[PDB]
């Protein structure tokens, strides 16, 4: 009709930062923990080092 605006609401400029930083922190934490749990030293004891 008159091409109204989308109704972008106030206080959004704070929620964006809040959610962004929380998401970044949580993603980084899961990344680091899974990464460390992958490169894991089983020990290389008489079960592992031994073969044949």
């Amino acid at each position: 009709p008159y091409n109204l605006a989308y109704k972008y609401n106030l206080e959004y400029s704070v929620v964006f930062n809040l959610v962004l930083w929380i998401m970044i922190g949580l993603a980084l934490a899961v990344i680091i923990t899974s990464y460390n749990i992958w490169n894991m030293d089983p020990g290389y004891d008489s079960i592992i080092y031994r073969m044949t």
Binding site: I32, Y35, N36, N39
Partner: protein
């Protein structure tokens, strides 16, 4: 190394986000929302001043500690078969602390000129306070970084000289030339930090 990989990942993600955001905004004719004036006018001069004040001592202390450990470890280790080197080789430690002394004096000097004001909008504050805050931040940053690199170089050469002196007594008295030439860059940093803020009249 996991930590280096983490740092690289964060850095690359940050710069990729910056590049993509910049390109889409520039193509989108939205250059009117990039008003750097608002970015560098909303910030209070006192934030810039106080960040400079903190750094002007923090980085100097960091450099002093770096040089202290780097020379002290070798001084203590190398004297087992030559206790004579304990007292001959104390010049390096003295300079490693003189760096922090210069840092503290500069912190005291720049700490002056902190009279508050009452303006709360950019049009009322004026140019003078903005100049004051920026200049004080710059002076603090330059003095801190100069003294940091100075202390590191001093500590490295002090370690080298202390370690070499245990072989022949007639070495150290001439190897200290590089040790003395170390401090000149920190002196230059202090001089420039002095000069940058010689015309601030905040208040």
């Amino acid at each position: 190394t996991g930590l280096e990989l983490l740092y690289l990942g964060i850095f690359v993600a940050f710069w990729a986000c910056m590049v993509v955001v910049g390109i889409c905004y520039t193509i989108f004719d939205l250059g009117f929302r990039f008003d750097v004036a608002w970015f560098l006018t909303e910030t209070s001069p006192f934030m810039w001043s106080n960040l400079g004040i903190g750094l002007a001592i923090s980085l100097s202390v960091v450099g002093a500690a770096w040089g202290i450990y780097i020379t002290g470890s070798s001084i203590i280790g190398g004297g087992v078969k030559a206790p004579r080197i304990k007292t001959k080789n104390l010049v390096s430690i003295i300079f490693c602390e003189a760096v922090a002394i210069y840092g503290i004096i500069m912190a005291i000097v720049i700490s002056n000129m902190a009279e508050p004001f009452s303006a709360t909008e950019p049009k009322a504050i004026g140019h003078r306070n903005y100049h004051a805050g920026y200049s004080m931040f710059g002076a603090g940053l330059t003095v801190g970084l100069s003294n940091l690199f100075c202390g590191v170089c001093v500590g490295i050469v002090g370690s080298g000289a202390a370690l070499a002196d245990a072989q022949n007594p007639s070495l150290f008295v001439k190897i200290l030339i590089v040790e003395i030439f170390g401090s000149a860059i920190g002196l230059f940093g202090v001089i420039v930090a002095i000069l940058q803020t010689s015309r601030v009249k905040m208040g």
